[PDB]
Amino acid sequence: PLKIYMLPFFAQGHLIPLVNLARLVASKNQHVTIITTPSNAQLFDKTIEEEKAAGHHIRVHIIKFPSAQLGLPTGVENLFAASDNQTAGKIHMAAHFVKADIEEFMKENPPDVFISDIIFTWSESTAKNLQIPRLVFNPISIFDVCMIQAIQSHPESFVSDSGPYQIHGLPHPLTLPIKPSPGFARLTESLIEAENDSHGVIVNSFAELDEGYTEYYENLTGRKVWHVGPTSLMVEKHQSLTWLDTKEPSSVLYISFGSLCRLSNEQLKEMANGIEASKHQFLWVVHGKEGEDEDNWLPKGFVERMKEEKKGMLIKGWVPQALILDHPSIGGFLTHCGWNATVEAISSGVPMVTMPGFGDQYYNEKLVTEVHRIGVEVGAAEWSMSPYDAKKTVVRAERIEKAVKKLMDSNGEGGEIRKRAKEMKEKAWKAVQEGGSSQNCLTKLVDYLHSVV
Numbered sequence: 001p002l003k004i005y006m007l008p009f010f011a012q013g014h015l016i017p018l019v020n021l022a023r024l025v026a027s028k029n030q031h032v033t034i035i036t037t038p039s040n041a042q043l044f045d046k047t048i049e050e051e052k053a054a055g056h057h058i059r060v061h062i063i064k065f066p067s068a069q070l071g072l073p074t075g076v077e078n079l080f081a082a083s084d085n086q087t088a089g090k091i092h093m094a095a096h097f098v099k100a101d102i103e104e105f106m107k108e109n110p111p112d113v114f115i116s117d118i119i120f121t122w123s124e125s126t127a128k129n130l131q132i133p134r135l136v137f138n139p140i141s142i143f144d145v146c147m148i149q150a151i152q153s154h155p156e157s158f159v160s161d162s163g164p165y166q167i168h169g170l171p172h173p174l175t176l177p178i179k180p181s182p183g184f185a186r187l188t189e190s191l192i193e194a195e196n197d198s199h200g201v202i203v204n205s206f207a208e209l210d211e212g213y214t215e216y217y218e219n220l221t222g223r224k225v226w227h228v229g230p231t232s233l234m235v236e237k238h239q240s241l242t243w244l245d246t247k248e249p250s251s252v253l254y255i256s257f258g259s260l261c262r263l264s265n266e267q268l269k270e271m272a273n274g275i276e277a278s279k280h281q282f283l284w285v286v287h288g289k290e291g292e293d294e295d296n297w298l299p300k301g302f303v304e305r306m307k308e309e310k311k312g313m314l315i316k317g318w319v320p321q322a323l324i325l326d327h328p329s330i331g332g333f334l335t336h337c338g339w340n341a342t343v344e345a346i347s348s349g350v351p352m353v354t355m356p357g358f359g360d361q362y363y364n365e366k367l368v369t370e371v372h373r374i375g376v377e378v379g380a381a382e383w384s385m386s387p388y389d390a391k392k393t394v395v396r397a398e399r400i401e402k403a404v405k406k407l408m409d410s411n412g413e414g415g416e417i418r419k420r421a422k423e424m425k426e427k428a429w430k431a432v433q434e435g436g437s438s439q440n441c442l443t444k445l446v447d448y449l450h451s452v453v
């Protein structure tokens with residue numbers, strides 16, 4: 001059994017995929033330690049207790065979050081607790097400050113293998129000075145870094161002031177309506193750089209989804225890709241459901257952007273008009289609007305006609321999203337294309353209507369709509385690097401209405417996309433089931449680590 005230390009970054013889209021990888025590797029009779037901070041460990045300690053109770057050798061080593069060095073108040077230890085770019089940048093800076101406590105812990109208790117999130121750039125020098133193999137963990141598909149690199153390597157394609165823009169050199173032709181904003185290629189230098197006797201990159205995706213981009217990346221960097229994901233699938237009555245029980249199969253568009261990527265008042269109004277003009281049934285979940293005048297973010301009397309024509313339901317608060325996406329009445333998912341939303345949509349076979357909000361979501365959109373055609377693209381109006389900055393432009397209602405109609409209408413393109421989405425669901429569960437690509441690759445990874453030690 002190997003001694004494997006796993007270092008997640010302090011963000012939910014990074015933390016939970018790496019924790020799930022930790023549960024998978026522990027389930028293969030390995031000694032796994034997750035190194036994290038107190039507020040983050042309490043997001044999954046109950047799962048760890050259940051794994052320990054099943055005989056799996058998995059534990060959490062607590063390190064102090066550098067709140068004092070950053071001037072952050074206690075309990076602000078992940079991006080979900082940040083509310084502005086300054087705080088978000090400080091949490092990114094925290095990845096550098098934890099280096100001393102982690103290096104000290106590893107010089108005293110050296111493990112056999114060190115697995116660290118892409119962000120901890122110091123992990124390379126730490127593994128060399130301790131003479132220990134290190135693998136990088138990428139919590140999303142390898143397609144994103146490929147799209148980024150293709151953009152970076154073709155600056156002549158983005159010289160025009162107005163789009164569309166062509167992305168060349170990839171397995172698929174890709175287009176962008178808006179050019180990437182300065183700094184779009186952050187947190188990729190560790191992934192794009194060539195190999196220096198690399199043990200590979202662990203990728204939270206599956207081979208079928210990344211097909212072609214796996215080879216593009218390996219050819220570009222020389223580094224092996226280990227597809228072991230989606231790890232959230234590998235480790236496997238609310239009034240909304242009651243309303244859905246009255247609707248025809250695949251007849252309801254589910255709309256949810258969550259809390260981080262919540263839309264502006266002007267954007268919510270454009271959305272309601274486009275959704276209403278689409279004439280399709282909808283389940284719209286909005287966060288952070290309880291006790292606010294609906295006229296501030298909805299058209300006049302939107303909710304009145306919404307219930308009179310029996311078209312839509314608007315929920316202000318938390319909904320069981322996993323059960324909603326599994327309900328047969330849902331026929332579409334309008335969302336921001338975050339990785340977790342993308343994986344959940346795939347796992348439920350639900351086609352997406354893509355409206356990316358910030359960051360990696362513009363690349364996730366293209367994987368969904370232009371590579372795999374398991375969703376429909378609304379059309380971005382602004383490229384934002386941050387979820388907290390207010391957008392100077394808005395996605396107009398006709399674009400939202402046209403995209404919903406394109407997916408939800410029967411006689412057209414939506415039938416193919418709906419069928420492709422159902423087939424990707426089967427491919428995703430097959431990859432994580434017994435004998436699937438990601439289960440086989442996880443076994444080969446652990447075997448390879450044994451021969452490296």
Ligand SMILES: O=c1ccn([C@@H]2O[C@H](COP(=O)(O)OP(=O)(O)O)[C@@H](O)[C@H]2O)c(=O)[nH]1
Nearest residue numbers: 257258259260261317318319320321322338
């Ligand atoms: O009303 C809600 C909002 C979110 N979620 C779950 O919370 C995660 C997504 O949270 P959120 O959208 O806030 O995260 P973001 O993608 O914006 O970072 C997923 O597992 C969803 O299933 C949920 O169950 N109900």
Ligand SMILES: [Cl-]
Nearest residue numbers: 017230231232
């Ligand atoms: Cl996942």
Ligand SMILES: [Cl-]
Nearest residue numbers: 263264267391
């Ligand atoms: Cl917005």
Ligand SMILES: [Cl-]
Nearest residue numbers: 436437440441
């Ligand atoms: Cl295989």
